[PDB]
């Protein structure tokens with residue numbers, strides 16, 4: 001099922017949805033996989049998250065050209081860490097419109113990231129303000145509250161059983177919540193549960209560092225985060 005393409009891996013999850021996977025060495029700790037999504041919406045392609053680097057992100061665009069061969073209309077990135085925004089320059093060099101939480105764009109320079117071109121803003125209840133996410137097609141963007149980071153956002157794919165929790169959600173057998181260096185430990189559990197409640201029909205939960213899982217990824221992540229309080 002997995003397709004090795006250069007140093008990256010691509011996996012079809014639904015007729016119009018693929019997961020992209022890229023790897024970066026964390027010195028002394030190993031090569032860390034990070035996952036994002038690629039969605040075909042009619043005659044265009046939508047991307048969720050870059051790869052770790054510009055070169056890897058250009059390779060995602062190469063794979064899209066060969067395997068889908070439609071223009072990439074936009075990309076949305078889910079927080080201001082390298083695994084999600086490290087390849088912003090490659091998207092801009094390709095002429096792709098880029099979107100991130102306003103807070104992600106504000107944090108980008110201090111995190112060593114390049115900001116996206118456009119800022120998403122969110123209603124008090126977490127749903128993106130639609131005027132800031134034009135032409136997003138089936139992508140439903142939701143801010144669940146602070147968790148893995150204060151700016152983390154999540155994305156559901158309308159017409160599918162798929163929702164993307166990014167680095168907020170860990171798989172149903174995960175032993176830890178990963179990198180908590182920028183985390184909001186007080187609010188993590190509630191933010192994880194809010195993601196689940198925003199996408200109740202999503203039976204396939206896609207996340208940054210594990211293969212897609214059932215909704216037990218959400219319950220287990222929240223249950224682990226209960227211990228942070």
Ligand SMILES: Cc1cc(C)c2c(CP(=O)(O)O)cc(=O)oc2c1
Pocket residue numbers: 026032081082083084167178179181
């Ligand atoms: C200190 C630290 C920071 C980051 C950003 C990472 C990441 C990327 P993140 O998952 O937090 O978006 C992965 C990792 O394995 O370790 C880290 C350690």
Ligand SMILES: [Zn+2]
Pocket residue numbers: 079080081148149167
């Ligand atoms: Zn992160």
Ligand SMILES: [Zn+2]
Pocket residue numbers: 083166167178208209
């Ligand atoms: Zn992560």
